[PDB]
């Protein structure tokens, strides 16, 4: 009956492509009065709690730390960008609830992010991380890719 938005967990998503690394920190917000609403079916309640809304808090790329052009897709650019994210999560008091890490692709920044989170740079965030997962998107047939490059 009253909006009671509360954070349930945080999602640390990393997209590691060939030319850049994108790191997004989000909050899974849950209106704790949703079940108190009128005209709400058992299915709508279960469907609302199975995919809770998300709000973006921190969005970073390798170009936000001053890496330009070809340097954006390198191991060092990702390692420093991961550090800046782990710092901004502590400077915003967003290290109270559990964090779920979602990795998307297999570029050069995937192993830098993992190294920065299992090392000194991520000794605070790692303590809250509860689940790691992979979200690489594959196609079963799907659209035709571009032709092979003759180099």
């Amino acid at each position: 009956y009253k909006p009671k938005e509360e954070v349930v967990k945080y999602i640390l998503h990393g997209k590691f492509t060939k030319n850049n690394t994108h790191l997004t920190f989000s909050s899974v917000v849950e209106d704790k009065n949703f079940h108190k609403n009128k005209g709400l079916t058992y299915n709508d309640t279960m469907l609302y709690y199975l995919n809770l809304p998300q709000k973006v808090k921190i969005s970073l790329s390798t170009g936000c730390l001053g890496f330009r052009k070809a340097a954006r897709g390198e191991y060092e650019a990702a390692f420093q960008t991961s550090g800046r994210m782990f710092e901004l999560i502590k400077e915003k008091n967003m290290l109270n609830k559990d964090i779920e890490v979602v990795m998307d692709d297999f570029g050069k920044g995937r192993a830098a992010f993992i190294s920065a989170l299992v090392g000194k740079e991520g000794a605070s965030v790692v303590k809250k991380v509860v689940k790691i997962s992979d979200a690489t998107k594959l196609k079963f047939g799907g659209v035709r890719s571009p032709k092979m490059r003759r180099l």
Partner: protein
């Protein structure tokens, strides 16, 4: 109602994808190593790379034929090495 509140835990994990690991708070680097093993046992990195550029069906078939032969050839090679080792052990 509460019926839709107390039955969300299993429901949440009932629609799993199989690409998730529960982190070991003690050794968090062992959980990332487990996740990497899943990726390699489902050929996720290889499939992603193979989907970047289109390959003609004839070329795809040739590559599949050659790979199978090399896999089978290696199994035959290992079978012969085991015989050699067994023969050596018995003094042949």
């Amino acid at each position: 109602a509460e019926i839709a509140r107390s039955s969300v835990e299993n429901a949440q994990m009932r629609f799993n994808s199989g690409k998730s690991i529960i982190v070991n708070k003690n050794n968090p680097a062992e959980s990332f190593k487990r996740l990497n093993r899943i990726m390699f046992e489902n050929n996720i990195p290889g499939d992603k790379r193979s989907q970047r550029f289109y390959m003609k069906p004839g070329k795809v078939a040739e590559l599949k034929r050659s790979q199978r032969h090399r896999k089978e050839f290696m199994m035959g090679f290992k079978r012969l090495i085991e015989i050699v080792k067994d023969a050596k052990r018995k003094g042949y």
